[PDB]
Amino acid sequence: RWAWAALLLAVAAVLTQVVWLWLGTQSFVFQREEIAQLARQYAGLDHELAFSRLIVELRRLHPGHVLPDEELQWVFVNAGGWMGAMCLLHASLSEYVLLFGTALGSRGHSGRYWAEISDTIISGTFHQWREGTTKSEVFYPGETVVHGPGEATAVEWGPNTWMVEYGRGVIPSTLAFALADTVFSTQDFLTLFYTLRSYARGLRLELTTYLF
Amino acid sequence: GSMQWAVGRRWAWAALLLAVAAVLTQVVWLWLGTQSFVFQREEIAQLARQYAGLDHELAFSRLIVELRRLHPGHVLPDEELQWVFVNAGGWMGAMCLLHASLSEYVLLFGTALGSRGHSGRYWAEISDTIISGTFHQWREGTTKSEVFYPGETVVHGPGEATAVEWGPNTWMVEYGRGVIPSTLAFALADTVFSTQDFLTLFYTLRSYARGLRLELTTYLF
Amino acid sequence: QWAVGRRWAWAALLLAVAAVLTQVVWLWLGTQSFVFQREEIAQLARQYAGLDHELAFSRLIVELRRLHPGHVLPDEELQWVFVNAGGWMGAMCLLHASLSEYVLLFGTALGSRGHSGRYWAEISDTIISGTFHQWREGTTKSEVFYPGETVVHGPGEATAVEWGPNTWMVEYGRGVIPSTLAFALADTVFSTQDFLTLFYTLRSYARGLRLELTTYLFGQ
Ligand SMILES: O=C(CCCN1CCC(O)(c2ccc(Cl)cc2)CC1)c1ccc(F)cc1
Ligand SMILES: O=C(CCCN1CCC(O)(c2ccc(Cl)cc2)CC1)c1ccc(F)cc1
Ligand SMILES: O=C(CCCN1CCC(O)(c2ccc(Cl)cc2)CC1)c1ccc(F)cc1
Numbered sequence: 218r219w220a221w222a223a224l225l226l227a228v229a230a231v232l233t234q235v236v237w238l239w240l241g242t243q244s245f246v247f248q249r250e251e252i253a254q255l256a257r258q259y260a261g262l263d264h265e266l267a268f269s270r271l272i273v274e275l276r277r278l279h280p281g282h283v284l285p286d287e288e289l290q291w292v293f294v295n296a297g298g299w300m301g302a303m304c305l306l307h308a309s310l311s312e313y314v315l316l317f318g319t320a321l322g323s324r325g326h327s328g329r330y331w332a333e334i335s336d337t338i339i340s341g342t343f344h345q346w347r348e349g350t351t352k353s354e355v356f357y358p359g360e361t362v363v364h365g366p367g368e369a370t371a372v373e374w375g376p377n378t379w380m381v382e383y384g385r386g387v388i389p390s391t392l393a394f395a396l397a398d399t400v401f402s403t404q405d406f407l408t409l410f411y412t413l414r415s416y417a418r419g420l421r422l423e424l425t426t427y428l429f
Numbered sequence: 430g431s432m433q434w435a436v437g438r439r440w441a442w443a444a445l446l447l448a449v450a451a452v453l454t455q456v457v458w459l460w461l462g463t464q465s466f467v468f469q470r471e472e473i474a475q476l477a478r479q480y481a482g483l484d485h486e487l488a489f490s491r492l493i494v495e496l497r498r499l500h501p502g503h504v505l506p507d508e509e510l511q512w513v514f515v516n517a518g519g520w521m522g523a524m525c526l527l528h529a530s531l532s533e534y535v536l537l538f539g540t541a542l543g544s545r546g547h548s549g550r551y552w553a554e555i556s557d558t559i560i561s562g563t564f565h566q567w568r569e570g571t572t573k574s575e576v577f578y579p580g581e582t583v584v585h586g587p588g589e590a591t592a593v594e595w596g597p598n599t600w601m602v603e604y605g606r607g608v609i610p611s612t613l614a615f616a617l618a619d620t621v622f623s624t625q626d627f628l629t630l631f632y633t634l635r636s637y638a639r640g641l642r643l644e645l646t647t648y649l650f
Numbered sequence: 651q652w653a654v655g656r657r658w659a660w661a662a663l664l665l666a667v668a669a670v671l672t673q674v675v676w677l678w679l680g681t682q683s684f685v686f687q688r689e690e691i692a693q694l695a696r697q698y699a700g701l702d703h704e705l706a707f708s709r710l711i712v713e714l715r716r717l718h719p720g721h722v723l724p725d726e727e728l729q730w731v732f733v734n735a736g737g738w739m740g741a742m743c744l745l746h747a748s749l750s751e752y753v754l755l756f757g758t759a760l761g762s763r764g765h766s767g768r769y770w771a772e773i774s775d776t777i778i779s780g781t782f783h784q785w786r787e788g789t790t791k792s793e794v795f796y797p798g799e800t801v802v803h804g805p806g807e808a809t810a811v812e813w814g815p816n817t818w819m820v821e822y823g824r825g826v827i828p829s830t831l832a833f834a835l836a837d838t839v840f841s842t843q844d845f846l847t848l849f850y851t852l853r854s855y856a857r858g859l860r861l862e863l864t865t866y867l868f869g870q
């Protein structure tokens with residue numbers, strides 16, 4: 218039975234080599250500049266119509282990578298002491314696209330992610346206070362603010378602020394932050410389930426499109 | 430030779446046991462049909478809408494007086510009235526509990542600084558009648574918010590979730606019907622995981638205990 | 651010579667340990683010394699309020715190092731680190747920290763609101779710039795504080811605090827400092843999950859403790 222462990226580790230090594238080669242040779246569906254430009258073109262419109270136009274355009278530019286209307290749902294998000302709402306359009310293990318915002322405004326922690334985030338503002342204001350600094354910057358509709366991996370900032374969204382977000386990195390690690398206040402502050406298990414279901418629907422779509 | 434009108438005593442005993450079993454299992458159900466709420470659903474709102482024109486101090490005092498006059502033995506006395514902090518859903522305010530049962534509660538809530546956060550999903554229906562200030566509500570699934578001013582009442586259905594914002598110096602009365610302990614579970618989340626203010630935990634639990642003691646001593650006398 | 655009961659000598663040793671512990675606690679309270687006076691940090695920081703908060707912080711650090719050498723962290727150990735607690739978020743820079751005392755620069759460029767925290771310690775805060783809204787427990791009114799003023803937070807008191815944009819202050823705290831650090835990391839653990847900030851805060855406290863120990867044993 219000593220060779221059974223050798224066979225198990227051999228199969229495991231070949232499988233891990235497959236996984237490594239696949240993770241290495243994977244391309245990305247979206248480009249940061251693509252999402253940024255699509256969101257900047259629609260910043261002048263009201264956020265409802267801008268969301269609609271951007272979703273239609275994303276669907277026509279990358280078919281099979283945008284959730285259908287039957288699976289689009291606004292879901293609240295409580296994290297880092299702030300509260301907003303998001304609608305997920307695309308979600309994989311390495312990429313995500315969503316619409317985020319708040320009609321009341323909010324303030325809190327940006328989150329320390331293993332990913333690169335890009336928020337292009339459709340309406341409102343985005344105040345960012347970078348770590349180690351004593352001043353804050355402000356971003357207005359049409360501008361794009363980037364969150365590098367391992368960075369943490371303080372964030373402040375003014376009333377009626379809405380943006381398009383494109384994240385790229387270790388996506389399953391970000392759920393730990395985005396659901397922290399849902400577990401320990403709001404105890405909103407229904408919203409937790411809705412978020413997990415949106416993520417799973419995005420994964421399902423990506424898998425079926427990759428398999429055809 | 431047995432008369433067809435007689436009844437065996439053991440069968441009669443067992444049949445009376447079955448009869449009391451059925452009668453008890455039937456009248457236990459009617460307890461959920463004879464449910465009596467101490468306050469009407471819109472009574473608290475129509476009561477507080479009258480004192481909205483005054484400052485919150487005098488308004489609270491006169492409303493407490495009138496509520497004691499209307500429902501004697503159902504409002505906590507001046508000895509047990511206490512302002513305690515409430516940290517929940519990422520917002521912070523203060524409450525003063527006037528009535529508390531396992532299915533109903535009434536309190537004076539508000540904030541002198543303003544706050545924002547998550548309303549919470551309760552197994553209960555909440556009603557907030559504004560005495561002073563502003564109340565901003567952002568319902569789930571929408572991308573817009575509504576504002577409520579003194580005199581108006583905001584109704585929060587069971588299972589609903591909204592984002593909320595209280596401006597500076599907002600004060601309201603509040604009435605709630607449903608599983609009150611489940612809502613107390615939410616009202617103490619940030620007190621445990623954010624503020625660590627165990628004295629506030631003790632204060633809120635003591636207010637609830639005083640309300641329950643008053644509701645039980647009124648039922649017995 | 652005679653014997654003592656199994657419960658007799660037990661209660662006798664209980665009383666002996668009680669006497670020893672009580673008199674030792676009293677002896678420790680008698681020998682308690684504080685590096686900074688109760689109103690020293692506030693008086694010193696009020697002199698720099700109104701200036702640019704950067705210039706004020708630099709001059710205050712220089713002055714504190716001049717007045718108490720060996721009790722202020724060196725430049726290579728000063729670091730701005732975020733703090734998330736009671737629903738509010740800001741940034742701190744620790745200048746002095748032991749088991750009984752601490753001195754820091756606190757503030758936020760965005761403003762925040764939350765729970766002050768209930769401590770076993772007396773905490774004074776002298777505003778360098780910005781605004782400080784306070785709401786005391788049991789009241790329905792709030793008091794505003796402007797630069798130059800000092801807000802005192804007594805042991806066991808709990809208030810609702812609000813900092814306006816670009817609010818910066820100097821803070822001196824005296825009491826059970828570990829119990830205040832416990833509150834200082836609540837949201838960092840259960841809300842932000844920023845383990846790097848947790849490490850930074852604990853490392854700053856450890857550096858303050860190390861400096862205090864070295865100066866106590868070797869005299870700065
Ligand atoms: O919703 C999220 C979490 C992103 C929050 N999202 C990132 C950080 C943010 O706070 C930010 C701060 C500073 C900067 Cl510079 C840029 C972005 C904006 C909001 C999510 C995560 C996983 C998932 F499957 C679905 C949704
Ligand atoms: O703390 C509470 C619950 C009331 C919170 N109180 C109601 C919900 C609230 O979040 C709300 C938001 C929006 C709307 Cl529309 C209505 C109500 C505002 C604060 C409590 C009170 C007494 C008790 F024994 C146990 C718990
Ligand atoms: O404990 C802390 C974090 C200070 C937060 N610090 C708490 C009190 C504060 O929140 C406050 C509230 C109300 C009032 Cl009135 C005044 C001050 C201000 C900020 C610490 C930091 C470094 C260290 F090495 C040891 C301990």
